[PDB]
């Protein structure tokens, strides 16, 4: 499913993402936008290390979810990577919450550093009523 901007903003707030571990809703929106373009079925294979990024937040199989084919990987979210390809984003959100509970926080995604960090991210939530 490809979410519309404000539709996603409202869904994320209801799932308790606003201010989670100090991360504002607009930051989560900026992350989803640059990671998948708000697309829940997005997958990206990394030929370099044999891992795959899954879903709206593009969560990596090396540490967060199990897909069976990634070498010496972990599954911190205790989920099949398939769970991160559903239209219902509850599982993806629960896993994203787990990722930021680590010391790096939102910095775990290099895309956030490149496209969101130190920028005016207000635009991602403007007019959405959140």
Q: Where are the domains of the chain?
A: 1-130
- 30 CB-near residues (< 8 Å, 6+ apart): 112, 115, 116, 119, 121, 124
Experimental determination approach used: X-ray
**What six digits make up the tokens of 18?**
């606003």
From the candidates 7, 53, 87, 91, give the one annotated as an active-site residue: 53
Q: How far apart are CA 68 and CA 87, in angstroms?
A: 22
- 55 CB-near residues (< 8 Å, 6+ apart): 36, 40, 41, 42, 43, 84, 85, 89, 92
From the candidates 4, 18, 35, 120, give the one annotated as an active-site residue: 35
Reported structure resolution in angstroms: 1.8
Please indicate whether residue 53 is annotated as part of the active site. Answer: yes
Q: How far apart are CA 39 and CA 102, in angstroms?
A: 25
Task: For 1-130, give the CATH class.
Answer: mainly alpha
Please indicate whether residue 7 is annotated as part of the active site. Answer: no
């Amino acid at each position: 499913k490809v979410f519309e901007r404000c539709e996603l903003a409202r869904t994320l707030k209801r799932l308790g993402m606003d201010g989670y571990r100090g991360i504002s809703l607009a930051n989560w929106m900026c992350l989803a936008k640059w990671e998948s373009g708000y697309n829940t079925r997005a997958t990206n294979y990394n030929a370099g290390d044999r891992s795959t990024d899954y879903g709206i937040f593009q969560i990596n199989s090396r540490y967060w979810c199990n897909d069976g084919k990634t070498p010496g990987a972990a599954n911190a979210c205790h989920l099949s990577c398939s769970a991160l390809l559903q239209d219902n984003i509850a599982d993806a959100v629960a896993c994203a919450k787990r990722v930021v509970r680590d010391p790096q926080g939102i910095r775990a995604w290099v895309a956030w550093r490149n496209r969101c960090q130190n920028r005016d991210v207000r635009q991602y939530v403007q007019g959405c009523g959140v």
